[PDB]
Amino acid sequence: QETQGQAAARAAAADLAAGQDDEPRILEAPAPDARRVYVNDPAHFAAVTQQFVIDGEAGRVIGMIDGGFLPNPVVADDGSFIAHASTVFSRIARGERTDYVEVFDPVTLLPTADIELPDAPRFLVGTYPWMTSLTPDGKTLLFYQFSPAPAVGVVDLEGKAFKRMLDVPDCYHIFPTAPDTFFMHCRDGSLAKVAFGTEGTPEITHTEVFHPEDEFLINHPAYSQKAGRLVWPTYTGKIHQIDLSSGDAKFLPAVEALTEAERADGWRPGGWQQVAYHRALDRIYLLVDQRDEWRHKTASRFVVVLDAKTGERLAKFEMGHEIDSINVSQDEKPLLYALSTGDKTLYIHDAESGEELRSVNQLGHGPQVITTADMG
Amino acid sequence: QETQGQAAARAAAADLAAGQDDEPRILEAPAPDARRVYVNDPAHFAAVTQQFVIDGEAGRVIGMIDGGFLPNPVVADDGSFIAHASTVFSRIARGERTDYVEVFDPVTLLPTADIELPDAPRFLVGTYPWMTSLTPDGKTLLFYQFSPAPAVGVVDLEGKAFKRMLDVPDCYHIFPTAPDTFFMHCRDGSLAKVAFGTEGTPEITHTEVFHPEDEFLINHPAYSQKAGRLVWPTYTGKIHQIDLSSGDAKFLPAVEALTEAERADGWRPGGWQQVAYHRALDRIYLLVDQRDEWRHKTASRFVVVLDAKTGERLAKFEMGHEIDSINVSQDEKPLLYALSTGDKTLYIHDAESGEELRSVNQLGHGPQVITTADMG
Amino acid sequence: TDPRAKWVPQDNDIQACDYWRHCSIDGNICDCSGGSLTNCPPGTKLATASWVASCYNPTDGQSYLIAYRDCCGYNVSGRCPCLNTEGELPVYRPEFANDIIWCFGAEDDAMTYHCTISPIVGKAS
Amino acid sequence: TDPRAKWVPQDNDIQACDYWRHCSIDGNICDCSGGSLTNCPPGTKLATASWVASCYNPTDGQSYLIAYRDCCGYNVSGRCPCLNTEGELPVYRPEFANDIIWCFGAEDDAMTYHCTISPIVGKAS
Amino acid sequence: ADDALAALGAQLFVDPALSRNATQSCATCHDPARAFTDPREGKAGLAVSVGDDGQSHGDRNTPTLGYAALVPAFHRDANGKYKGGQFWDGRADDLKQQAGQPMLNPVEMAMPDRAAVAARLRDDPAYRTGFEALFGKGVLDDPERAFDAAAEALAAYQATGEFSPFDSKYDRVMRGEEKFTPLEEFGYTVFITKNCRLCHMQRKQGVAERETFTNFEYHNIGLPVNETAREASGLGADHVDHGLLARPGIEDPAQSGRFKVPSLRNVAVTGPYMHNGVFTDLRTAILFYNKYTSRRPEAKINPETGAPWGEPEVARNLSLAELQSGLMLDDGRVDALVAFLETLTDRRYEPLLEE
Amino acid sequence: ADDALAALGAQLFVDPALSRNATQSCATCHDPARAFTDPREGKAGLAVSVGDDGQSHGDRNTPTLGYAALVPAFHRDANGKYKGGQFWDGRADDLKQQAGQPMLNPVEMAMPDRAAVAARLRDDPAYRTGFEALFGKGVLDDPERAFDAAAEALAAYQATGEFSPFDSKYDRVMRGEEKFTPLEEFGYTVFITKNCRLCHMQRKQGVAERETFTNFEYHNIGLPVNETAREASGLGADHVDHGLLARPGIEDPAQSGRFKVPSLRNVAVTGPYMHNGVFTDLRTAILFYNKYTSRRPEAKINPETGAPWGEPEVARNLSLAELQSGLMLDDGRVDALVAFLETLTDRRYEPLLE
Numbered sequence A, B: 001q002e003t004q005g006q007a008a009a010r011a012a013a014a015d016l017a018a019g020q021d022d023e024p025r026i027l028e029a030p031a032p033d034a035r036r037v038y039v040n041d042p043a044h045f046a047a048v049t050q051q052f053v054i055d056g057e058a059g060r061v062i063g064m065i066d067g068g069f070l071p072n073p074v075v076a077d078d079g080s081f082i083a084h085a086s087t088v089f090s091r092i093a094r095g096e097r098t099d100y101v102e103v104f105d106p107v108t109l110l111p112t113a114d115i116e117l118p119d120a121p122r123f124l125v126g127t128y129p130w131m132t133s134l135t136p137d138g139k140t141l142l143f144y145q146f147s148p149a150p151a152v153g154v155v156d157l158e159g160k161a162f163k164r165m166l167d168v169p170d171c172y173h174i175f176p177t178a179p180d181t182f183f184m185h186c187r188d189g190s191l192a193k194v195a196f197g198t199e200g201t202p203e204i205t206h207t208e209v210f211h212p213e214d215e216f217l218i219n220h221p222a223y224s225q226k227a228g229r230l231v232w233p234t235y236t237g238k239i240h241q242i243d244l245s246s247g248d249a250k251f252l253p254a255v256e257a258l259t260e261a262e263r264a265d266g267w268r269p270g271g272w273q274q275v276a277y278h279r280a281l282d283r284i285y286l287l288v289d290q291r292d293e294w295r296h297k298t299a300s301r302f303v304v305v306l307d308a309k310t311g312e313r314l315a316k317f318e319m320g321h322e323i324d325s326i327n328v329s330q331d332e333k334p335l336l337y338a339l340s341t342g343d344k345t346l347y348i349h350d351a352e353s354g355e356e357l358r359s360v361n362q363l364g365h366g367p368q369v370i371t372t373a374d375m376g
Numbered sequence C, D: 001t002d003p004r005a006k007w008v009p010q011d012n013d014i015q016a017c018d019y020w021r022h023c024s025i026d027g028n029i030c031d032c033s034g035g036s037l038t039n040c041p042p043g044t045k046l047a048t049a050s051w052v053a054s055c056y057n058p059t060d061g062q063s064y065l066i067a068y069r070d071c072c073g074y075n076v077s078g079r080c081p082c083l084n085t086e087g088e089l090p091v092y093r094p095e096f097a098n099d100i101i102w103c104f105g106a107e108d109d110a111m112t113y114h115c116t117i118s119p120i121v122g123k124a125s
Numbered sequence E: 001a002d003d004a005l006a007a008l009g010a011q012l013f014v015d016p017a018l019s020r021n022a023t024q025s026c027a028t029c030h031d032p033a034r035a036f037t038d039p040r041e042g043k044a045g046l047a048v049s050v051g052d053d054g055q056s057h058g059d060r061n062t063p064t065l066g067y068a069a070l071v072p073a074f075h076r077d078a079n080g081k082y083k084g085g086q087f088w089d090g091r092a093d094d095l096k097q098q099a100g101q102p103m104l105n106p107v108e109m110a111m112p113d114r115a116a117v118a119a120r121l122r123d124d125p126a127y128r129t130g131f132e133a134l135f136g137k138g139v140l141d142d143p144e145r146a147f148d149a150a151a152e153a154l155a156a157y158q159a160t161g162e163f164s165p166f167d168s169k170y171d172r173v174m175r176g177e178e179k180f181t182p183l184e185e186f187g188y189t190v191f192i193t194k195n196c197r198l199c200h201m202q203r204k205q206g207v208a209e210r211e212t213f214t215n216f217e218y219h220n221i222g223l224p225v226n227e228t229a230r231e232a233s234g235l236g237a238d239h240v241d242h243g244l245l246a247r248p249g250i251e252d253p254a255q256s257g258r259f260k261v262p263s264l265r266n267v268a269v270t271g272p273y274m275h276n277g278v279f280t281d282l283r284t285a286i287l288f289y290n291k292y293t294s295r296r297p298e299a300k301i302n303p304e305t306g307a308p309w310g311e312p313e314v315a316r317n318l319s320l321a322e323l324q325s326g327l328m329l330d331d332g333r334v335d336a337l338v339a340f341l342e343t344l345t346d347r348r349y350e351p352l353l354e355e
Numbered sequence F: 001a002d003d004a005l006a007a008l009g010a011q012l013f014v015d016p017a018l019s020r021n022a023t024q025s026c027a028t029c030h031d032p033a034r035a036f037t038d039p040r041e042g043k044a045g046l047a048v049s050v051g052d053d054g055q056s057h058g059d060r061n062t063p064t065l066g067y068a069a070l071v072p073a074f075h076r077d078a079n080g081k082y083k084g085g086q087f088w089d090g091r092a093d094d095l096k097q098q099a100g101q102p103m104l105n106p107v108e109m110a111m112p113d114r115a116a117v118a119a120r121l122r123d124d125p126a127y128r129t130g131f132e133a134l135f136g137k138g139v140l141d142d143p144e145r146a147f148d149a150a151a152e153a154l155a156a157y158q159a160t161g162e163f164s165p166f167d168s169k170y171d172r173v174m175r176g177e178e179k180f181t182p183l184e185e186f187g188y189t190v191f192i193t194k195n196c197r198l199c200h201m202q203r204k205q206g207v208a209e210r211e212t213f214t215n216f217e218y219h220n221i222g223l224p225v226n227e228t229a230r231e232a233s234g235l236g237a238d239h240v241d242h243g244l245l246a247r248p249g250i251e252d253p254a255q256s257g258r259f260k261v262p263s264l265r266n267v268a269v270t271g272p273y274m275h276n277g278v279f280t281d282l283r284t285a286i287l288f289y290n291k292y293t294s295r296r297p298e299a300k301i302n303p304e305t306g307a308p309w310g311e312p313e314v315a316r317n318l319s320l321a322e323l324q325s326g327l328m329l330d331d332g333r334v335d336a337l338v339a340f341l342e343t344l345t346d347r348r349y350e351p352l353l354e
């Protein structure tokens, strides 16, 4: 209840009283831990953007990373590094385009790699976490390409070198399940498993179709790589879950995030990152509110929490803010993070009682994307 | 009464009703005229910034130009081109620095020149319009350097090449008076006249010291190249007028913008571009409010207008908003432009009676600098 | 104004987020940075790629197909920002998907997003 | 919070713009982007140039020289922005001028402005 | 008279007496049963038609007359684009100007001159009756008058509903009488979102009253020579079909290799495709477009030959702005485009669609 | 008691008996009338001192003893920066360990051994009394105890208020007793804003109680050899002065060429400057730092010679991060710096200033 700034004013004043000298210098961020959280600000399509590194336990900005045009952040689950795929131009937003990947040390935040991507191959789109992804060993970054056609670009972070583009079918998003394998979601309603070497036609296998042409699967599914759990809401709060843990798709029973009464009274999911998944609790969190069927990208004020196994509602939190994106820490007694684009604030909640504990404001221009590491 | 966006829906409905086809295309901005106004947004030191081109008669954005870090804009008085000196970095705000000048066609807004400035020689500072200046023939751009010392870069727009740096003494700002001559203001409180040929040292001559070591001259004097009038306010609203029209500095009678009683009740100028000068009317506009002596950069709610020769006050406007910058168009019945950094909105007033006619909002993050061309 | 209410088109102001042809716009209206309803601002580059929505025109009771187009090569305008999603489908139905930067085809390989125009291309409900 | 009122320094919160040491800060407070009062955030470069101001400390009634220093090589942080100008002079008195991006001496030639730290280096006198 | 004129033209249209050896009428090459195209096989397959002498082949594919009456007369618009006209190179101003040309063209109907055409018209009492009723007495005795009158009647005939009935599934779907199948609907959605619409739609924007799927402009899409057709025409291995630049009066070398954008109505049934009939299958004509967008090696290969498409006949003034869209058509989209183009088939030709 | 010890060192300090030929005392080279430096002209002018033999010149400029008592004992700090000790290369831990070394140095006072020092000490009845009162009976009969006691006396004398009086104009101004002139305050402003404060201030932040205008650190600022001082020293044209590295037990090649940041107190009256006295004028010392910042031809040239400064004696470990500040000192600021530095002169040496 003593704030950050207040405690800090008390300590500087004590040092001044004591004749305490110290050397002005560049701080190191605290060690990455389960309660660090990163918030990416695509800034409503601005040519340059920011990420904030936050200690969610303190509610304190501990660092920042600059990026260019709609970069894709990724965070190694073990905390050893962070990276992004970014795009810059020789004259702000015009002239020659350079796409690249940087890797950063998670405490000094310095770039430890800057890997040029040839032929400007990134997909420029409102930020979707699973359009750029790390493999589980942290060795490879996979990024999606839409033009001329769907493709996936393979970047070696270990050897700090772009490898190749892989041709894919009419499919979207990249869920890595192994050093050489990832899943995508296809137009025809199946998933495609993509297995890749250094060379050859990658082996591409479709799963069974798992949804009709008129159920709409949202751009922001939750994927837990350590659980292999892909949690995929539709526009109605119907939740698809696919178990990728065997390395093949197993389709789990669908659950309904909302009741039939709530659906009849206009409750639907909506926002940007609408869904979160806590691996250790096996719980799903969904951003929902009463809304017309085509206001699916608007903020929502409520989170439903349900047991992933049974679909049983565990809670419904009234968030008390216009929340676009949520995510949770992966530790015991997780934090529930609730990011307001309109407010440029990350609100930090006890994921158990839903109570707001603290918040971090002034996060850029239109912050949209929350990332945590799953370290346990 | 009918807004632009209303008139436009009606014209579009009528086109639809009539079956009128029209090719989607890149619009040309209307011809530059006296009522065109440019608003530069340094964006509170963001690495990338924007300049808005506005038809101040319609209160319409007619185009935009992008710029890098703290760019310096210039606008040819005859309306034949615009330019800026700007700065980019290879990875947003980090990596190799490139300083450069672009010249732009002022109806297509296309870059007509991109002239690299060797060894990153630009002064990076909160935007001061006369830190970068066109010679009157429009063939030469001169920009200030601070590090390692005061110096002035000569840029040939016609050859489209950087020429050389000139050594100057301890002086600031650049007020060009001729193809090969500019004045600057020195630490000792003199003006220095700088004359350069192709070769050698420039020929540098100082005037008398014209202000005491403790009367402080603002960073944003108004200079009118066509009248050779340098209007230089001090922190108290005292106003120095230097006549450069002979090739040489005649010092005009100094004049006071606020009354004795007004500087007792704490009336002071404050803002960014605190002062504007209308050339054919020979008339000075000053942003002022009641403020502490060290709140000299804060917005003001009031504009006083005085005669450059007599210094009699002609008007005092209650602006109705927090104004940081002012400027005027240079035609008859001039518009008085009032830029609020805080509202990001240019308010466009009748310079005559002071009433707000119309405004142009959403002008970036922290717009600060108004530029107009003196065409008649 | 209630972000969650059903969208209500009007045909009286193109600078407004509820203008009928912006029913699936994402970004900024070009009219507000010196384009017009169907033309790009000076110095930007008109994409040839398009996204479509079926938008109800409350002037004539008809729904029209709006093939949106981006004006590219400039940082985002920041004026008249709007996001509507009438009929908007997820990315894997890209013809109706509007988070994508549809700058393909733009002169000079321009790919940064500046603003979007809303020309009609035909009728159909 | 009246912007044209004389500045009222406090010694109880370093993140607020009325903090006593910030009397001539121009930009952003590094404590809000992962620095601290007298340290730079990770990834930035500390300049060796500085600005000085004499700043009044309401706690002991004493005046300290603050030699501000910029943390450079990052885009402006956008958090806790503050502009105060106590004793701040025009650019031709650059030792007291605060629109200048005082990033000289920063490692790697870093010249972009991210934020400013507020260390004491003496008593005014 | 509006009826009777069309009615006269209907008679002329099917009358092989307007050809030298009387073997050939308009209907011979423009056969009503095949959407007014030539079903006949020549030394180049269906790519080019054989004239009245039974041996001369032309150098362009015979186009449909369906919806040809919606084409504006030839003009240069304000943006300096040429538009409208008849023939693939626009060298005729309009239908009337075009109609007398097959008649005197030694590679087509081959009449020696107007006088000889008048003589044939005079030999038929029905023509003396029908021409004199519309054009006055002795019209057939004046070779200039008679030849102009036949062209006019033929043009009026091509402007009737029989030629442009607007009863395709597309039209029925646009009138709300039925719905597209999901594949057709996707196809229509691709057509309008991808670059096809930049050239194959009447208007840049707004709604066309009578859409015929062409903007009537001239574009070089970079098609190679049709070697077997070019051999049949005997124009020479060094010949260049300059498209619009061949129109007398056009001198601008920027017009070299541009041809009029064809209406896609009935496209499913008027193969082979393009101005030289170079592509046999509709899918192939769609796939040519991927040579400009796709980076896959298969995109630079004509699936009908397994060889590269070829160097363009005119490797300059290509419509690269439109063609290099940055987005290739994957197979599912080409499938949708084929289904949609098939909806453009007139009701009477639906049964042709099966094969 | 602490008082008598210092009175004992006051005696020894001006006693030529502690030199071999009895021609010199500490005060001969550390002249009290010259802020404890050497007024005497030699083969290299004032750059280096002549010892007791009347011939041998040193290779380093004799520094002031004023304020040396504020220097902490030599240590490596937690950042791995060496700080303090005595001599330009910190090879003495502190004043006590320094005091015996001139006595036994053949190019200085030239006593053969501790024994001969002790013999000289016993020859004086005033020392038998003074020393025996402080360290006990027989102290002078034991040459190890005698020498070490003389060292202690000297060190205690140097730690008196007389050596560090903090009565310069700058001390007065900090006490609010007087104001700087505009030039002096500008100079102070220039000194704290520009790179000087990075090395020539005790602390990095907060307020120093007894500022002596050094952080006690070791820096190679890339000075050239003093050609005539080097020839006079007889150390050979081959010789390289490795600064800190020459301290025994310093092994790290990174300290080569590094010297103890001198206190700037009395700078104005203690020319010539730098470890080797290469520059006669204080302005030249200030101007030398412009070699790393100005682009002007004039910056590359030593004004006292008209020829380039010359290459660094040790052209590695330069403190570039600090020295390459991006900003040069125009003539005006060099003027002000000079004026501010002149305010660092002790009261008693103000008349020297003319």
Ligand code: HEC
Residues within 6 Å of the ligand: E013, E024, E025, E026, E027, E028, E029, E030, E049, E050, E051, E052, E058, E060, E061, E062, E063, E064, E065, E068, E085, E086, E087, E088, E089, E095, E098, E099, E100, E102, E103, E107, E108, E109, E154, E155
């Ligand atoms: C031997 C076959 C043949 C005969 C008989 C023939 N045509 Fe054609 N038709 C063509 C070919 C080939 C073209 C394309 C020629 C070109 O563009 O140079 C053509 C094109 C036309 C066009 C232009 C259509 C377009 O889209 O540009 C019209 C109109 C036309 N024919 C009508 C007629 C009429 C009326 C007659 C009878 C007087 C006729 N044709 C006789 C082969 C023939």
Ligand code: HEC
Residues within 6 Å of the ligand: E194, E195, E196, E197, E198, E199, E200, E218, E219, E220, E221, E223, E258, E259, E260, E261, E262, E263, E264, E267, E270, E272, E273, E274, E275, E276, E282, E285, E286, E289, E319, E322, E323, E337
């Ligand atoms: C830049 C202009 C342009 C674009 C884009 C374009 N076309 Fe064409 N199209 C042409 C022209 C011109 C021709 C005639 C070319 C020739 O014969 O010389 C043509 C011919 C065709 C034909 C042959 C019709 C016939 O009667 O022989 C088909 C089928 C066709 N286009 C479909 C498409 C589809 C589907 C697309 C989108 C993938 C498309 N076009 C894009 C201009 C264009």
Ligand code: HEC
Residues within 6 Å of the ligand: F013, F024, F025, F026, F027, F028, F029, F030, F049, F050, F051, F052, F058, F060, F061, F062, F063, F064, F065, F068, F085, F086, F087, F088, F089, F095, F098, F099, F100, F102, F103, F107, F108, F109, F154
């Ligand atoms: C012959 C001239 C000469 C005499 C006599 C001499 N000194 Fe020195 N003094 C020097 C020189 C030269 C240096 C620097 C030598 C070096 O750095 O290696 C020096 C350095 C010092 C220092 C270190 C000061 C600093 O800031 O590093 C102290 C303390 C000192 N002398 C005290 C004494 C005492 C006590 C005596 C009498 C025992 C004495 N000196 C006799 C010339 C002399």
Ligand code: HEC
Residues within 6 Å of the ligand: F194, F195, F196, F197, F198, F199, F200, F218, F219, F220, F221, F223, F258, F259, F260, F261, F262, F263, F264, F267, F270, F272, F273, F274, F275, F276, F282, F285, F286, F289, F319, F322, F323, F329, F337
């Ligand atoms: C990198 C640390 C550093 C910086 C920055 C620095 N100095 Fe020094 N200064 C030294 C060292 C070390 C010496 C002694 C060097 C030597 O003799 O080898 C020295 C010596 C001096 C001397 C000679 C003192 C004497 O007793 O011989 C003067 C005068 C001086 N500096 C003034 C300045 C001024 C004024 C500035 C700012 C323009 C400055 N210095 C910047 C470290 C520094």
Ligand SMILES: [Ca+2]
Residues within 6 Å of the ligand: E037, E061, E062, E063, E270, E271, E272, E273, E274, E277
């Ligand atoms: Ca055909």
Ligand SMILES: [Ca+2]
Residues within 6 Å of the ligand: F037, F061, F062, F063, F270, F271, F272, F273, F274, F277
């Ligand atoms: Ca000296």
Ligand code: NA
Residues within 6 Å of the ligand: E044, E047, E226, E227, E228, E229, E278
């Ligand atoms: Na062929």
Ligand code: NA
Residues within 6 Å of the ligand: E244, E245, E246, E247, E248, E249, E250, E251
């Ligand atoms: Na021609």
Ligand code: NA
Residues within 6 Å of the ligand: F044, F047, F226, F227, F228, F229, F278
């Ligand atoms: Na010498």
Ligand code: NA
Residues within 6 Å of the ligand: F244, F245, F246, F247, F248, F249, F250, F251
């Ligand atoms: Na050593």
